[PDB]
Design a protein around this nucleic acid. Sequence first.
RNA 1: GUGGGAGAGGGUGGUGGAAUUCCCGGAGUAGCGGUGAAAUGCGCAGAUACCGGGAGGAACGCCGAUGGCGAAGGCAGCCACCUGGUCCACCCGUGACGCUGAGGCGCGAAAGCGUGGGGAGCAAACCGGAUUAGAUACCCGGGUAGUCCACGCCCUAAACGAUGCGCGCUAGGUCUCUGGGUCUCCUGGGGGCCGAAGCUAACGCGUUAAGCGCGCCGCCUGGGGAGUACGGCCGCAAGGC
Lengths: 119, 88, 101, 73
Amino acid sequence: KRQVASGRAYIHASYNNTIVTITDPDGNPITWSSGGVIGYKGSRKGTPYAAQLAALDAAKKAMAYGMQSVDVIVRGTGAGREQAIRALQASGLQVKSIVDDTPVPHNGCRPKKKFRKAS
Amino acid sequence: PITKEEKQKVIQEFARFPGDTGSTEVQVALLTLRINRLSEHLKVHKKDHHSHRGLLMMVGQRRRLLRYLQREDPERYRALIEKLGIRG
Amino acid sequence: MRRYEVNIVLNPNLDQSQLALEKEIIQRALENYGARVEKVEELGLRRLAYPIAKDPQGYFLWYQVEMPEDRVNDLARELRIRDNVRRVMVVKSQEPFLANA
Amino acid sequence: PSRKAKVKATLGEFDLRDYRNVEVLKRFLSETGKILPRRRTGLSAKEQRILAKTIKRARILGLLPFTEKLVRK
RNA sequence: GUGGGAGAGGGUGGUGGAAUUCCCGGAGUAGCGGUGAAAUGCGCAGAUACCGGGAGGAACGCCGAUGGCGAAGGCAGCCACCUGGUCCACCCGUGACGCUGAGGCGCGAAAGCGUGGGGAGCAAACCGGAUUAGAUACCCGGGUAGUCCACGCCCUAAACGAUGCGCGCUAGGUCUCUGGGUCUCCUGGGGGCCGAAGCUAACGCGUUAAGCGCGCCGCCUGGGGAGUACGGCCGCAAGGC
Ligand SMILES: [K+]
Ligand SMILES: [K+]
Ligand SMILES: [K+]
Ligand SMILES: [K+]
Ligand SMILES: [K+]
Ligand SMILES: [Mg+2]
Ligand SMILES: [Mg+2]
Ligand SMILES: [Mg+2]
Ligand SMILES: [Mg+2]
Ligand SMILES: [Mg+2]
Ligand SMILES: [Mg+2]
Ligand SMILES: [Mg+2]
Ligand SMILES: [Mg+2]
Ligand SMILES: [Mg+2]
Ligand SMILES: [Mg+2]
Ligand SMILES: [Mg+2]
Ligand SMILES: [Mg+2]
Ligand SMILES: [Mg+2]
Ligand SMILES: [Mg+2]
Ligand SMILES: [Mg+2]
Ligand SMILES: [Mg+2]
Ligand SMILES: [Mg+2]
Ligand SMILES: [Mg+2]
Ligand SMILES: [Mg+2]
Ligand SMILES: [Mg+2]
Ligand SMILES: [Mg+2]
Ligand SMILES: [Mg+2]
Ligand SMILES: [Mg+2]
Ligand SMILES: [Mg+2]
Ligand SMILES: [Mg+2]
Ligand SMILES: [Mg+2]
Ligand SMILES: [Mg+2]
Ligand SMILES: [Mg+2]
Ligand SMILES: [Mg+2]
Ligand SMILES: [Mg+2]
Ligand SMILES: [Mg+2]
Ligand SMILES: [Mg+2]
Ligand SMILES: [Mg+2]
Ligand SMILES: [Mg+2]
Ligand SMILES: [Mg+2]
Ligand SMILES: [Mg+2]
Ligand SMILES: [Mg+2]
Ligand SMILES: [Mg+2]
Ligand SMILES: [Mg+2]
Ligand SMILES: [Mg+2]
Ligand SMILES: [Mg+2]
Ligand SMILES: [Mg+2]
Ligand SMILES: [Mg+2]
Ligand SMILES: [Mg+2]
């Protein structure tokens, strides 16, 4: 019970799962959801439809706190990123801006063998 | 580095005549100056090998020029060695 | 004796007394290392592109100087001791390279 | 093919080695803090090679950003 | 010699931001992660996702390329110092002082060895989860030596252009790096492509020769046995010649 009425929306989309965290303008979260919060258990979390369900569930949880306008922030190249974008875009929540903030390093750490042949 | 004033100092010091800038004595004197500078640079920074190769090349060039002077005029050869203090 | 340029970014929150003391220490350290000053440009506080020392702005100072090379590095360290001084960049002076002329 | 505009042609007389002039080097950065390629700047090899180091100097000074965030995606 | 030029050429010191991990705090709830699908694993001692602060190590995104430098290995944030190589213009100086080079000497990616330090990420061995007929593998979760630094060893390679070095001669076209100039262009050095003559068994090479010549060094003489044995030299050992 905070009555935020305006906040931010972080979308962490990976090839294995999409997870949405709805926070306040200072970054402190309020509610959240993911593919595991919905009944999907295994690989079905890395699905665009599961990402849509997670986005809509986080949005409805944010409606309880009486929030109207959001600022969307995208991190990670994963299936279902744009689907969660379109889910939050028309969900009763007003989307004020979409920003991709995927953390790209400057060739700092050595990746796993799965991600090698690069630096 | 090696500024132009020191270079002109050694050139005018070892010149066979006013205007000479490329005689054997001048070349050997300049190579000796550069060699001493590089050796003082290589006492410290002893892990620098790419410059040690240049030192080897300069030493070889100076030895070949001194050998030519030895063959042609041994008097100027002894004079150059005495003035510079080479061969130990 | 080469020509250099010193960029000093320090705390924009300093009052005039603390800023005067910082610049006094800068001038004193420049005298202590024999750095003749040819000109100076004080740009004041400006908006940084990223926060430095948790502060979104910075007070800039620029000095075109001439000093012996052998102590240039040894001078820079002395300028980094002050906590108010948060950026020090010394760059050998170069003739300007104009484009689209 | 980058047929929109060349940064050099969209500009006048300026110093490439000046790391303190921000309002000119900002035009050479992309929407992100990245340095534009040759096709966007329209410079030459030497000009681009100098611009790179000068932009990096301005970045370390805190005048130009290392990276930004994309908008309107 | 004089005057200029470009460069991740090398060594030393300092310094910058992104990211990973860990710690502290805030906020916050039932999973995260991972895969073809899963499980081990981690999570109610509050993880994942989010914000802020801090610590540490390692590598330098865009620029960046078919690019540049070096004799080779190889060299990529930035600044400073020390330093090597190299190219151009002037036609100034010496007056054949040149080429190559058995031995010698030095350099020599990675891995490995010794002593000390450091240890974030990655990761031989190893501990597990899967898969499989089995899986001492590929896939997944962990993880030590190591990767990193100083000093000293080790001398190997698809150390590759599978093409030793130097010089002279022999159509051009095009792209590009870098100087100079009467700057449509010419001229010089370097990196590519296409091709004259010619060469080659062919593929292909072709002013960066594998063409035409000259000098010098290295090496080859069927395959296996075998880079093995013996001997010697070198090495702490692994082992190398
Ligand atoms: K469970
Ligand atoms: K190359
Ligand atoms: K140890
Ligand atoms: K061979
Ligand atoms: K020109
Ligand atoms: Mg999953
Ligand atoms: Mg300070
Ligand atoms: Mg370098
Ligand atoms: Mg916590
Ligand atoms: Mg785990
Ligand atoms: Mg774990
Ligand atoms: Mg458990
Ligand atoms: Mg409980
Ligand atoms: Mg975490
Ligand atoms: Mg943090
Ligand atoms: Mg630690
Ligand atoms: Mg690249
Ligand atoms: Mg080269
Ligand atoms: Mg190679
Ligand atoms: Mg003449
Ligand atoms: Mg004569
Ligand atoms: Mg030779
Ligand atoms: Mg030999
Ligand atoms: Mg080795
Ligand atoms: Mg090693
Ligand atoms: Mg060791
Ligand atoms: Mg150890
Ligand atoms: Mg691991
Ligand atoms: Mg593993
Ligand atoms: Mg196993
Ligand atoms: Mg089978
Ligand atoms: Mg079974
Ligand atoms: Mg050990
Ligand atoms: Mg090769
Ligand atoms: Mg070869
Ligand atoms: Mg050849
Ligand atoms: Mg050519
Ligand atoms: Mg051809
Ligand atoms: Mg023919
Ligand atoms: Mg043919
Ligand atoms: Mg030839
Ligand atoms: Mg036989
Ligand atoms: Mg054999
Ligand atoms: Mg045989
Ligand atoms: Mg062997
Ligand atoms: Mg034996
Ligand atoms: Mg022995
Ligand atoms: Mg063994
Ligand atoms: Mg053997």
